[PDB]
Structures are given as structure tokens and as C-alpha cells.
Amino acid sequence: ALKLEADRLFDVKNEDGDVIGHALAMEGKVMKPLHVKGTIDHPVLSKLKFTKSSAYDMEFAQLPVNMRSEAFTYTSEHPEGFYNWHHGAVQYSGGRFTIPRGVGGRGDAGRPIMDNSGRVVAIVLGGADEGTRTALSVVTWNSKGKTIKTTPEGTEEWSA
Amino acid sequence: ALKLEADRLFDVKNEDGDVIGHALAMEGKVMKPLHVKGTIDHPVLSKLKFTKSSAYDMEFAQLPVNMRSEAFTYTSEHPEGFYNWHHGAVQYSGGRFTIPRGVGGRGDAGRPIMDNSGRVVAIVLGGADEGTRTALSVVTWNSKGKTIKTTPEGTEEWSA
């Protein structure tokens, strides 16, 4: 028997219905970048009361009992190398996650960066056009569990 | 098993009998653009007293009980893409509904913009010939059901 999991990433839509961001189910909570302004496309998640974590461009709520099962597992351990995300490979070097120029864009805020074990190592907030590559603004947590917001200069929102 | 619906769109005629606009049965009421000065081509609807919603160039009346059944359904969810109206494809992008130049004109005010499920997405008030494409002046509603009127510069209210 093989396993096919339910979604742990949900769309955040604007009034018209365009996807302008994403909400992640991870470690007991639902979390999305605070700058992503819209509604979570989920009947239950869209009704929760979110706590702002403004200093890190994040907002969260505890997951409903039925969703705690289907939740991503996060890891602070992510040694220099190649990772993956919805649009392809991601490189982590010099404490920076970069991707090909012209790959990330609108609605991409909120997407996770995964390692080869299916664990999340970072949450994408946006990214910066550095010419030869795009440097990502990301949210991570250290070994002790402290939230870190890393933002390259010229980082754009990747939402609306 | 096939349906065959009665009309939810009615002609608004001038004193000479010519069609200068349209009235629509949607969400419990008859509604027409206020700038369209004529008579609704219908024995019942022509005898209703309308209430002006001037800020939106609209005029409305409650639909008789028999017409409330198959009246059009409105949806505020209408992401970027292609819609349709009486004269062809309609593009919705960057918050604007555009059609090809030289396609819409006199008499078209009151016509609905429809989505792929037979729901109404907007009401055409007129348009702005922008040389290459024609941008439409439309009445829409948001998630909360609040009226909105969007008008491009250069808009000409079809048939006034």
C-alpha cells in the first residue's frame, strides 16, 4: 500500500477569487504570511481567529483537531545544498535560499521549501531579483525554535 | 432531459419602439441602468415603481413572485480569465473587463457578463474605446453584497 496525503497548503484568495498567497498546516498550526491579504479557501480555516506575529510577517492559529494529523513537520537542520519547492529546485548557500530568475512571482507567498524527507525547512515570503538568480525572503525556526525572518534587499511581496 | 428557460433579460424601448437598453431579473429583482430612459418591454415589469441607486447608475424593483424562480444568480467570485456576454468573449484582467473594439455599443447597456456556469458576474453600463480594445464600465457586487461601479476614463454610456 502506498500513501497519498491530503493537502497541507491552502489557497488565500482575493475578493475576485485569484490566488494571492498560501496558508500552511504545520506543527499543530495554520500559518500564512501576514502581508498576504485575503481569505483562506477552506470552510473551517477561514473562520479561525488569527494571532499576528508582525515582527516576522506571519499570522497563525491552532489547527482544528481533525487537521492536526495532516500537518507538515518542520526542521531547522538544513545544510547547504539543493532543496525543492512547487516551482523546482532551490539552492541554500551562504545562509540564503535562491532560485532561477523569473520563476517565483505572484501568489507564491506562503509556499514551503521542502527537503528530501518531505519536511519544511522554510516558508517563502517573497523574493529579490538579483539578476543572475532570485534571493528568497524566508521564515525559519532555529534548533531552539526561535522564529527568524531573513530578507534580501529588493525583496518583493509575491502576493497580489 | 433538457430545460428551456423563459427570458431573464427584457428590452427597454424608446417611444419609437427601438431597443435602447436592457433590464435583468436577478437576485429577486428587476434592474436596469438608470441612464437608459425607456419602457421595459413587459406587461408586468413596466407597471412597477423603481427605486433609483444613482451612485451606481442603476434602478431596481422587486420581481413579481412568478419571476423570482429562475432569476439570474450573481457571484462576486470571478478570477482573471475569459467570460462571455451576448457579443462574444470578454476578458477580465487587472480588475477590468475588456472586449474587442467595434463590438459593443448602443443598446447594450443592461446586458450581463456571464461566467462558465450561467451565473452573472457584472452588468455592462457602457464602454471606453481605448483604440485597441474596449474597456467596460460595469456594475458588480463584492462578497458582502455591496454595490460597486467601475468606470474607465473615456467611457461612453451606451445609448443616452
DSSP state of B74: B
Query: Do the Cβ atoms of A141 and A150 come closer than 8 Å?
Result: no
Contacts of B144 in chain A (CB under 8 A): none
- The CA-based dihedral angle spanning residues A124, A128, A133, A136, taken in that order and rounded to the nearest 10 degrees: -20
User: How far is Cα A116 from Cα A100, in angstroms, rounded to an integer?
Assistant: 19
CB contact under 8 A, A16 and B143: no
Helix (H, G, I), strand (E, B), or coil: what is residue A146? coil
Query: Which of A72, A71, A57 minimizes the C-alpha distance to A147?
Result: A57
Q: For B100-111, give one letter per residue: b (16+ CB within 10 A) or e.
A: eeebbeebbbbb
Distances (CA, A) of B150 to B56, B124, B125, B136: 9, 10, 9, 8
Distances (CA, A) of A114 to A38, A83, A117, A138, A145: 25, 6, 8, 13, 18
DSSP secondary structure string for all residues of B100-144: ETTS--TT-TT-EEE-TTS-EEEEEEEEEE-SSEEEEEEEEE-TT
Query: Which of A40, A6, A7 minimizes the C-alpha distance to A21?
Result: A40
Interface of B with A (CB under 8 A): 76-80, 95, 142-143
Query: Do the Cβ atoms of A149 and A57 come closer than 8 Å?
Result: yes
Q: Which overall architecture, per CATH, does domain B73-158 show?
A: Beta Barrel (2.40)
Residue A155: alpha-carbon gap to chain centroid: 15
DSSP state of A70: S
User: How far is Cα A108 from Cα B87, in angstroms, rounded to an integer?
Assistant: 36
Same fold, B8-72 and B73-158: yes
CB contact under 8 A, B79 and A15: no
User: How far is Cα A22 from Cα A30, in angstroms, rounded to an integer?
Assistant: 10
CB contact under 8 A, A16 and B77: yes
Resolution in A: 2.0
CATH number for the region B8-72 comes to: 2.40.10.10
Contacts of A15 in chain B (CB under 8 A): 76, 142-143
User: Cβ atoms within 10 A of the Cβ of A141, count?
Assistant: 18
Q: Which value, in Å, is the radius of gyration of the alpha carbons in chain B?
A: 15
Q: Where are the alpha helices (DSSP H) in A32-76?
A: none
Nearest-neighbour CA in chain B from A15: distance (Å): 7
User: How far is Cα A60 from Cα A8, in angstroms, rounded to an integer?
Assistant: 14
- Residue B61 backbone dihedrals phi, psi, to 5 degrees: -150, 150
DSSP state of A50: P
Q: What angle do CA B91, B95, B101 make, to 5 degrees?
A: 40
Q: What angle do CA B135, B139, B140 make, to 5 degrees?
A: 110
Query: Do the Cβ atoms of A109 and A117 come closer than 8 Å?
Result: no
Interface of A with B (CB under 8 A): 15-18
With CA atoms as reference, the chain A residue closest to B142 would be A15
Classify strands A58-62 and B133-141 as parallel, antiparallel or unpaired: unpaired
Domain ranges of chain A: 8-72, 73-158
Residues in a beta bridge with B137: B126
Element (H, E) at A20: strand A19-26
Q: Which three cell numbers stand for residue B69?
A: 424562480
Query: Which of B68, B67, B85, B56 minimizes the C-alpha distance to B150?
Result: B56
